[PDB]
Design an enzyme around this catalytic site. Structure first.
Site, short mmCIF file in Angstrom:
data_model
loop_
_atom_site.label_atom_id
_atom_site.label_comp_id
_atom_site.label_asym_id
_atom_site.label_seq_id
_atom_site.Cartn_x
_atom_site.Cartn_y
_atom_site.Cartn_z
N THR H 1 44.50 42.96 39.35
CA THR H 1 44.53 43.81 40.52
C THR H 1 45.23 43.09 41.66
OG1 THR H 1 42.51 45.00 39.92
CG2 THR H 1 43.15 45.04 42.24
N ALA H 49 35.81 50.14 42.06
CA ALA H 49 36.51 51.41 42.20
C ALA H 49 35.68 52.41 42.98
CB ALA H 49 36.87 51.97 40.83
#
Lengths: 199, 230, 239, 248, 213, 228, 204, 201, 238
Positions: H1, H49
């Site tokens: 990420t 998330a």
């Protein structure tokens, strides 16, 4: 981690912060400001958990502004310092404690200039010059070597130059640029930004 | 038809549901209390309705602590409630300060209790006026309160039927400097002035307050004293 | 159907205490307020100095922030409570989103509080009507007024208190397009409003200004004497 | 007609209970405070001057509230106790929070808000009590204030109680002083005011009460003065009455 | 001590088609080193156009199924219309975040048709995020199935192989072969297969058995 | 007598709701007409002073990007109801990624249009017109203080609503067009108003399925006025 | 310990007709001092002092809380406070935090309001009172002050020898102490006057 | 990420990867991390998330309510402030959230950085994620203020390419957004393998 | 007459006139008729409008897959009891995973409506429910009242001028039990066409019919499956 220095003079308070907002490896922000102008002659600096610093800025800054707009005149530095100490001591014993390190700079018409000194255990102190972090140690040695209560403001600035020259020589940390205020009979005057090319 | 009830003032005057409570107090049983130089003497007028009733059951002179006497002139069922309140409150003071509570402080807090009950608007106030006394710090005291929550300090006063006549006699007969026994004598005199005449060891009930403490006297010493005391 | 209570309607569809609480405002002291293009200014009448006390405590014009200015009518205690609440609301808004407080949001707060205060069970509504002046968005001068029902209602000039119809009627005959700015003409406009006041005693006039960037400035009873002198000069030049 | 409760309005818009609270004020004790620098005074009239009391309280209307402030009072007497305990608690909360004495104006507005919350809310009895304020601060010096049951408060220099003091306010205006901070002058003026306004023949000292507040070197002491100086004040004022009858 | 969780396993497959949504799952419910049953379909028919499958902790699967049915009835009985697929996806995401600090240990897949009449698969996670994808494999057999669907559906890592759109019957043969190939190697898989197909005309079901060990 | 919301009549009825329906009448008028091309809507402002800034008084507010509103009666009850609808619409989009249809909006408003209760406050004093476009084309919706909500094809409210409905049913049929309904509405407006119709008196709010955004007309309304 | 976070040492010693209280001046974190002017002896009315040692936050908060309740008591009742009343009040204030305790050891030193009767007592962190006649001590260092005061105390002491005895005891026990030092304040009070002296201590 | 954001003369560049794994197992390759808040606000997904999605959706809700109450578009510092005050109410309870807030302001460009630790700051360049330090290096190589549009596009594309090249937790499609003065615009969504063929030689 | 103000006050004759005033408030609703066969329960109501352009206010509203209600009286209390009704359905649907017996549901309705008829502070609910359901023992037609004395019947009708409907039910309650759905529904509207004045005719847009069956889910209809039900009629015998 970092440290913001707070020298008391005869009729001035010489405060000096950094401009660093690093996150565990990298320097995210190199022009940071930790200076919280409460009113026309009262400042506040803050070092601690960086989620709580903004919260103290909100609470103390705005509630002192609320007192000012309510009553009609500006607080003493002593009453504001005690208000902060009372709020830290009350919010200490909760499910949400606050862990910052403050130091207070104010100026009275009667008491003249004033310096206060906090802790993360919410202690008042009336000091000539304060400490936090590890710049604590490295400033306090020279600063207690060369203190005179009857010192001029230019000698204080020169002393800060000299101490910063000693700070850039034996740390682990980076600390490139230091921002500096001063308080007088007028109010908050920002001096020039104090940075150093090292080599 | 007004005032009615406790939430509004009058058009010009005072509070009618306090004035009527004072009227019911003034329609109560007579009593007298005299502050002497060394002690304070309280005494009441307690006639049973029939000859059936017992005089070892209900007690008018009532201690709040070991050094505080307290009587009333009014309605017993409210009297007991506020006395029990004063008991618990004095014990709370003795919990906090570990020291016997001064009578002025009792009067402050009991007066606050009664004034809280005169606050609007769902309960009536008491039909009870008090007489509080005790020998606190050498100088004895004598504190009369009222259903309005206020209080006073007397040298000698009375409450009940013909209290104006008893007050004129206490103005006439009593003075500043007496002893405990002389105060007992003039107290029984001003009680017998307005009571019925058939007065025995049982129709009156007397408690005194020495500097040695409160003392609630017995019918033995009462009939020893009141057997034609003058 | 009756003047009690606040909760039931009239048989022809009215609220008596909503209509009646405005009368306490309508019998109250007069306070006007106009907007310039850059400098906004207002003032109250009937200072009414009773010869033996101070009057710095009776000030009917205050501020919640450095950007907003106050006035009211009706009774003073409701104004005290509403302003003391509104300061804390302004500061709580500042504790939120970091803008200078818009005049529109704080007027919605005050009128909303006043209304949901009115709707409740047996609470006497605040018989005031505030004047809320500020210039925030690039110095856009705004002034709103309130109502005991709680309806904010944006104007360009305003007049309340005793005889407000006549005082507002003067602004109808005064307020042409080219008022401001022209700050001096806005100054003379406030002066002509004070001369058109119900008494216009000359010394009982108290006016406060805001140049949309500065602070609140309380004037001096010698500048206003010069203003009345030049207004009388204009009246003589009309002759 | 439109009586019943404190809330809501009578159709004018006027009020019922504020007016009736002031008419409850008027039949009570008379008090006053005077224009004085370097000190300030309070006067009070003794209600219930019957001979069988004790007077062992030293203070019946005066309440030395924080350190440097006292307050006279007038009206329903138990509500005065209710408000004075709370007001001491407010001042002591302020001192707890800041370690600074309370500068008296926010104290006055706090008590006015306490009274006003019972003016708006319903159905509660509003406090039918007006009361005075003397005190000292760091910002204005010696001060005088007038609390009202409406919640309005007036900064005065010569104050006003009810029907027994309208003539007192008339004498205070007609005999207005300014410039003299000498406390004995204002005490003689107050003695004259209570001599005319009270119906006490020749002003017996048992029917009067005087308390003063002076600034001494850091302390701001409050002087509940005793009776003998009141006696010689009476003799001084009656010698001034002899000076007044020198024109005969 | 008391543990609040236990791993029941499961295997859920979904394929977004041109105008279809195929969801299939085995019906084995096991725990530790034993078999509770050989008949428990993880697939559930919500509307005419929506099928959900839920693997993981079995009790939370049942409870979540019942709560979802309740809110379906709430929306219809309030607003006179059935939900779309993505609305159900948002609703399930809000529920899974509404129990954030004590999570459902449940994998979730919603398949169904959009308002255009095309297949739409919304994957999920135990905390409540989602996205519109073409194919997912949920359960213990996720890694045993995802690269083969990358090979066939996505045509990934191939050269000179053009893109033919996935038909229905080819996808059926794909589902049968992937569950046979995963049932050869997984231990939480076998004995049956509940295949559900969403068309523009309703829901078809089909049961294909497997090996019995 | 009739003295409160907790007492019926010997024949019906409230007798507080009736006085709320009577308190509809004091307000300024407003007219909306549902056309399958889109919902047009109009209102009178009733400006008192020239100091009274005309764009500040709200009559058409925006609840959703395709949902308008109009208010009739007490301003602040209407502001509360608009506030609650603005909250609830956003929650529906939140929990469903879609637009709450206008009938469901009105059910949500009329859930506590009558939840009036002072113990266990008063009923509200405003009638509301809702215009919007759901999946079924445009929708025009008319509620009341009593929560008795129904659809209306062309509803008129407030003062002089009787002859407004009369001349409206005189001119209306099902297959109207847009600008014809606009001018037909403003004819009825300048028949029921007392002042000369100009750019400051009225304002229009037009929503279309292909023109969902900007349910308003600004100073082209001048051009619409001058065509009569 | 938690008591040894900011240091602290308070000594009180009862004389013949007077009483003397003394404390240290150092304030700082565990090894890093900050200042030399920290107050730990607070005047509570006239001729009645209190000493506080331990955690400085609890020291200042408890001192302000006691000042609060003290002013409310002395303004409800116009007389000044007796020392036993103060001792019961302090014990109540500590025992309200029975399971949430403050970290301090209060020492009360004052005279009689009516007579000249001296008084000493000291309390624990939960509110256990203890009256003695010779001396009470508190803070981080204990055994040093116990040894010195049991070494040098006599029952009937003129104020000069009382002053010099508490002086030598405090100076030697502080010089043996590590985390508490940096100067000594001494309060010697009596019926006539109140004397406050500061000693020339080792600043090491 | 790995995300990053940097503002310049002509608005703000926002770019990120699309890889979101599950430990050592890749969940997906096409996770659109840069959450579209408004037609004028763009937030990212940085670590966890559900927290990013939920609290930015709640921020979008509150921004819409603000706009409908004040008839006025909200400022960027306002959004970062509200987000920090919302997230700070669960301090210590274990929320991971390190997003950025971008948008156009009356002051002009807007760039703030909000953590679940509550580290609300402005700045000029930021980069969040595991392989963020790679992006810091290549961006602070290539940073200026006076860059062009295609220059900034190729800069950020190079940056995400380097970050996904060295880190293992990053990959997928490279999204690329561009904030203007009027409104934001998606520029491109580029796959890594295309960029490796294009830039490798 | 000073005692005829509140719910709590007993009359000196013992009759709470608040209840009868609630009854008279119920009697001003629309006409509706409910009637069952052995296998099929049909309730038919009548719509009304504010104006010609306005829509018709619906009466029959959906509740559950086997429960649907008619209504007459207030609308806020109607939707309030609708929300309570749906809640009581889905609660036991969640807990027991079964559809409810109707009898315990309507007992819950009575216990719900008892407290606003006994304490002070809430008015009794003006309500006209006709409830059709299917437990294990077939269809049920219950009716309610503001006095919470719920009645079980085989054929009822409430609202304005419903007495002619009741007499029609009297003269065909022998005939209702055996027939199938179609002529049962046209018996229902041969009660509703006598709930009207005879100078107008029952149209399409004013009626709605709801059938729930022992195998048929509860379904509301409006003009479109009703135009098939509106044929098969004769005129009124003028």
């Amino acid at each position: 981690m970092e440290y913001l220095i707070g020298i008391q003079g005869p009729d001035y308070v010489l405060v000096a912060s950094d401009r660093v907002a690093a996150s565990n490896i990298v320097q995210m922000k190199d022009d940071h400001d930790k200076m919280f102008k409460m009113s026309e002659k009262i400042l506040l600096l803050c070092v601690g958990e960086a989620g709580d610093t903004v919260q103290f800025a909100e609470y103390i800054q705005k509630n002192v502004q609320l007192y000012k707009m309510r009553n009609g005149y500006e607080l003493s530095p002593t009453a504001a310092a005690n208000f902060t100490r009372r709020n830290l001591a009350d919010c200490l014993r909760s499910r949400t404690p606050y862990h910052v390190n403050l130091l207070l700079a104010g100026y009275d018409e009667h008491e003249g200039p004033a310096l206060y000194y906090m802790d993360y255990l919410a202690a008042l102190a009336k000091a000539p010059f304060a400490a936090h972090g590890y710049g604590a140690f490295l400033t306090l040695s020279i600063l207690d070597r060369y203190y005179t209560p009857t010192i001029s403001r230019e000698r204080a600035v020169e002393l800060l130059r000299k101490c910063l020259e000693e700070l850039q020589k034996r740390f682990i940390l980076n600390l490139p640029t230091f921002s500096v205020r001063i308080i007088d009979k007028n109010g908050i005057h920002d001096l020039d930004n104090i940075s150093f090319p090292k080599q | 038809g007004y005032s009615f009830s406790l939430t509004t003032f009058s058009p010009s005057g005072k509070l009618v549901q306090i004035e009527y409570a004072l009227a019911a107090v003034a329609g109560g049983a007579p009593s007298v209390g005299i502050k002497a130089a060394n002690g304070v003497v309280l005494a009441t007028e307690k006639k049973q309705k029939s000859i059936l009733y017992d005089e070892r059951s209900v007690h008018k002179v009532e201690p709040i602590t070991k050094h505080i006497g307290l009587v009333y002139s009014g309605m017993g069922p409210d009297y007991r409630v506020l006395v029990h309140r004063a008991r618990k409150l004095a014990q709370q003071y003795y919990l906090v300060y570990q020291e016997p509570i001064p009578t002025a402080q009792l009067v402050q807090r009991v007066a606050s209790v009664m004034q809280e009950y005169t606050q609007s608007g769902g309960v009536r106030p008491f039909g009870v006026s008090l007489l509080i006394c005790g020998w606190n710090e050498g100088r004895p005291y004598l504190f009369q309160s009222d259903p309005s929550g206020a209080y006073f300090a007397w040298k000698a006063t009375a409450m009940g039927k013909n209290y104006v006549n008893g007050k004129t006699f206490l103005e006439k007969r009593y003075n500043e400097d007496l002893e405990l026994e002389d105060a007992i004598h003039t107290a029984i005199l001003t009680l017998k002035e307005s009571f019925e005449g058939q007065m025995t060891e049982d129709n009156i009930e007397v408690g005194i307050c020495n500097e040695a403490g409160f003392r609630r006297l017995t019918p033995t010493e009462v009939k020893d004293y009141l057997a034609a005391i003058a | 159907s009756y003047d009690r209570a606040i909760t039931v309607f009239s048989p022809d569809g009215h609220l008596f205490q909503v209509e009646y609480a405005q009368e306490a405002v309508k019998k109250g002291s007069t306070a006007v307020g106009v907007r310039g293009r850059d400098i906004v200014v207002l003032g109250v009448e009937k200072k009414s100095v009773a010869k033996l006390q101070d009057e710095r405590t009776v000030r009917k014009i205050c501020a919640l922030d450095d950007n907003v200015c106050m006035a009211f009518a009706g009774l003073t205690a409701d104004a005290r409570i509403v302003i003391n609440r509104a300061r804390v609301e302004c500061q709580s808004h500042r504790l939120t989103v970091e803008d200078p407080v818009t005049v529109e949001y704080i007027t919605r707060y005050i009128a909303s509080l006043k209304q949901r205060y009115t709707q409740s069970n047996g609470r006497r509504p605040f018989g005031i009507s505030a004047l809320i002046v500020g210039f925030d968005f690039d110095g856009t001068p705004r002034l709103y007024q309130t109502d005991p029902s709680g309806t904010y209602h944006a104007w360009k000039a305003n007049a309340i208190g005793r005889g407000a119809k006549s005082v507002r009627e003067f602004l109808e005959k005064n307020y042409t397009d080219e008022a401001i700015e022209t700050d001096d003409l806005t100054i003379k406009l406030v002066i002509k409003a004070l001369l058109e006041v119900v008494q216009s005693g000359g010394k009982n006039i108290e006016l406060a200004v805001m140049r949309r960037d500065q602070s609140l400035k309380i004037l001096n009873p010698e500048e206003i004497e010069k203003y009345v002198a030049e207004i009388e000069k204009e009246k003589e030049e009309n002759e | 007609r439109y009586d019943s409760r404190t809330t809501i309005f009578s159709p004018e818009g006027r009020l019922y209970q504020v007016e009736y609270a002031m008419e409850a004020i008027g039949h009570a004790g008379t008090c006053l405070g005077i224009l004085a620098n370097d000190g300030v005074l309070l006067a009070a009239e003794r209600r219930n001057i019957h001979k069988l009391l004790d007077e062992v309280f030293f203070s019946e209307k005066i309440y030395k509230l924080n350190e440097d402030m006292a307050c006279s009072v007038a009206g329903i007497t138990s509500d005065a106790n209710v408000l004075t305990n709370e007001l001491r608690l407010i001042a002591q909360r302020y001192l707890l929070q800041y370690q600074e004495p309370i500068p008296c104006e926010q104290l006055v507005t706090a008590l006015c808000d306490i009274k006003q919350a019972y003016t708006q809310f319903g159905g509660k009895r509003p406090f039918g009590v007006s009361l005075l304020y003397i005190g000292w601060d760091k910002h204005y010096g010696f001060q005088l204030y007038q609390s009202d049951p409406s919640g309005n408060y007036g900064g005065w220099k010569a104050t006003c109680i009810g029907n027994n003091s309208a003539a007192a306010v008339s004498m205070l205006k007609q005999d207005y002083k300014e410039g003299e901070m000498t406390l004995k002058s204002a005490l003689a003026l107050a003695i004259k005011v209570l001599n005319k306004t009270m119906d006490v023949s020749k002003l017996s000292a048992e029917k009067v009460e005087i308390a003063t507040l002076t600034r001494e070197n850091g302390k701001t002491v409050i002087r509940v003065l005793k009776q003998k100086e009141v006696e010689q004040l009476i003799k001084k004022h009656e010698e001034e009455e002899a000076k007044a009858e020198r024109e005969k | 001590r008391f543990s609040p969780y236990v791993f029941n396993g499961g295997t859920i497959l979904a394929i977004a088609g041109e105008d279809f949504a195929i969801v299939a799952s085995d019906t084995r419910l096991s725990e530790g080193f034993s078999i509770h049953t050989r008949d428990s379909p993880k697939c559930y028919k919500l509307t005419d156009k929506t099928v959900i499958g839920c693997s993981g902790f079995h009790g939370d699967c049942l409870t979540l199924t019942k709560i979802i049915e309740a809110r379906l009835k709430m929306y219809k009985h309030s607003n006179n219309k059935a939900m779309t697929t993505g609305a159900i996806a948002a609703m399930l995401s809000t529920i899974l975040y509404s129990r954030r600090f004590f999570p459902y240990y449940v994998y979730n897949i919603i398949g169904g048709l959009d308002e255009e009449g095309k297949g739409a698969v919304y994957s999920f996670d135990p905390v409540g995020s989602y996205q519109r994808d073409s194919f997912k494999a949920g359960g213990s057999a996720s890694a045993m199935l995802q690269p083969l669907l990358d090979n066939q559906v996505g045509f990934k890592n191939m050269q000179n192989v053009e893109h033919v759109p996935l038909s229905l019957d080819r996808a059926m043969r794909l589902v049968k072969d992937v569950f046979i190939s995963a049932a050869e190697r997984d231990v939480y898989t076998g004995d049956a297969l509940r295949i559900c197909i969403v068309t523009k005309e309703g829901i078809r079901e089909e049961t294909v058995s497997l090996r019995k060990d | 007598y009739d003295r409160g919301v907790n007492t019926f009549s010997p024949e019906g009825r409230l007798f507080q709701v009736e006085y709320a329906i009577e308190a509809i009448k004091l307000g300024s008028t407003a007219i909306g007409i549902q056309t399958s091309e889109g919902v047009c809507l109009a209102v009178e402002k009733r400006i008192t002073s020239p100091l009274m800034e005309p764009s500040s008084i709200e009559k058409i507010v925006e609840i959703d990007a395709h949902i308008g509103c109009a208010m009739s009666g007490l301003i602040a009850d209407a502001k509360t109801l608009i506030d609650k609808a603005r909250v609830e619409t956003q929650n529906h989009w939140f929990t469903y990624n879609e637009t709450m249809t206008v009938e469901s909006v009105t059910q949500a408003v009329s859930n506590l249009a009558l939840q009036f209760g002072e113990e266990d406050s008063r009923p509200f004093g405003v009638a509301l017109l809702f215009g919007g476009v759901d999946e079924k084309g445009p929708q025009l919706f008319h509620m009341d203080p009593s929560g008795t909500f129904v659809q209306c094809d062309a509803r008129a409210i407030g003062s002089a609503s009787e002859g407004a409905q009369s001349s409206l049913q005189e001119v209306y049929h099902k297959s109207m067009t847009l600008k014809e309904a606009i001018k037909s509405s403003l004819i009825i407006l300048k028949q029921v108003m007392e002042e000369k119709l100009n750019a400051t008196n009225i304002e229009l709010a037009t929503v279309q399925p292909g023109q969902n955004f900007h349910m308003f007309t600004k100073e082209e309304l001048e051009e619409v006025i001058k065509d009569i | 310990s938690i008591m040894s976070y900011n240091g602290g040492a308070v000594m009180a010693m009862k004389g013949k007709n007077c009483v003397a209280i003394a404390a240290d001046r150092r304030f700082g974190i565990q090894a890093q001092m900050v200042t030399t002017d920290f107050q730990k002896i607070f005047p509570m009315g006239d001729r009645l002092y209190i000493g506080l040692a331990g955690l400085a936050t609890d020291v200042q908060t408890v001192a302000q809380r006691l000042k609060f309740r003290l002013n409310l008591y002395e303004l409800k009742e116009g007389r000044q406070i007796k020392p036993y009343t103060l001792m019961s009040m302090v014990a109540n204030l500590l025992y309200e935090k029975r399971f949430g305790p403050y970290y301090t050891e209060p020492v009360i030193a004052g005279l009689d309001p009516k007579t000249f009767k001296p008084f000493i007592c000291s309390l624990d962190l939960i509110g256990c009172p203890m009256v003695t006649d010779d001396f009470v001590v508190s803070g981080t260092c204990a055994e040093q002050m116990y040894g010195m005061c049991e070494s040098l105390w006599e029952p009937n002491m003129d104020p000069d020898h009382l002053f010099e005895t508490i002086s030598q005891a405090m100076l030697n026990a502080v010089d043996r102490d590590a985390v508490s030092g940096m100067g000594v304040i001494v309060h010697i009070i009596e019926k006539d006057k109140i004397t406050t002296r500061t000693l020339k201590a080792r600043m090491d | 990420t790995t995300t990053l954001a940097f503002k310049f003369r002509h608005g703000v560049i926002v770019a990120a990867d699309s890889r979101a794994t599950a430990g050592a197992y890749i969940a997906s390759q096409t996770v659109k991390k840069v959450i579209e808040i408004n037609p004028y606000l763009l937030g990212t997904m940085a670590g966890g998330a559900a927290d990013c999605s939920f609290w930015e959706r709640l921020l979008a809700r509150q921004c819409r309510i603000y706009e409908l109450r004040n008839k006025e578009r909200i400022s960027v510092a306002a959004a970062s402030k509200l987000l920090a005050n919302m997230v700070y109410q669960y301090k210590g309870m274990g929320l991971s959230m390190g997003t950025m807030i971008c948008g156009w302001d009356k002051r002009g460009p807007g760039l703030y950085y909000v953590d679940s630790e509550g580290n609300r700051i402005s700045g000029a360049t930021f980069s969040v994620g595991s392989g963020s330090v790679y992006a810091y290096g290549v961006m602070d190589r290539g940073y200026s203020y006076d860059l062009e549009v295609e220059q900034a596009y190729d800069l950020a594309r190079r940056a995400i390419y380097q970050a996904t090249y060295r880190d293992a937790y990053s990959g997928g499609a490279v999204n690329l957004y561009h904030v203007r003065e009027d409104g934001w615009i998606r520029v491109s969504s580029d796959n890594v393998a295309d960029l490796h063929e294009k830039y490798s030689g | 007459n000073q005692y005829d103000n509140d719910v709590t006050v007993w009359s000196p004759q013992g009759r709470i006139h608040q209840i009868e005033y609630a009854m008279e408030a119920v009697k001003q609703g629309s006409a509706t008729v409910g009637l069952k066969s052995k296998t099929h329960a049909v309730l038919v109501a009548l719509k009304r409008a504010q104006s010609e352009l306005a829509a018709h206010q619906k009466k029959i509203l959906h509740v559950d897959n086997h429960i649907g209600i008619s209504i007459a009286g207030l609308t806020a209390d109607a939707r309030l009891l609708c929300n309570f009704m749906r809640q009581e359905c889905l609660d036991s649907r969640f807990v027991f995973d079964r559809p409810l017996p109707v009898s315990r549901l309507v007992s819950l309705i009575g216990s719900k409506t008892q407290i606003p008829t006994q304490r002070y502070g809430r008015r009794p609910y003006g309500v006209g429910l006709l409830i059709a359901g299917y437990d294990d023992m077939g269809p049920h037609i219950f009716q309610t009242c503001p006095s919470a004395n719920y009645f079980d019947c085989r054929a009822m009708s409430i609202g304005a001028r419903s007495q002619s409907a009741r007499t029609y039910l009297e003269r065909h309650m022998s005939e209702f039990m055996e027939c199938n759905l179609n002529e049962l529904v046209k018996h229902g509207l041969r009660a509703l066409r006598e709930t009207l004045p005879a100078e107008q005719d029952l149209t399409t847009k004013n009626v709605s019919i709801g059938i729930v069956g022992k195998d048929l889910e509860f379904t509301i209809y409006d003009d479109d499956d009703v135009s098939p039900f509106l044929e098969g009629l004769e005129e009124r015998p003028q």
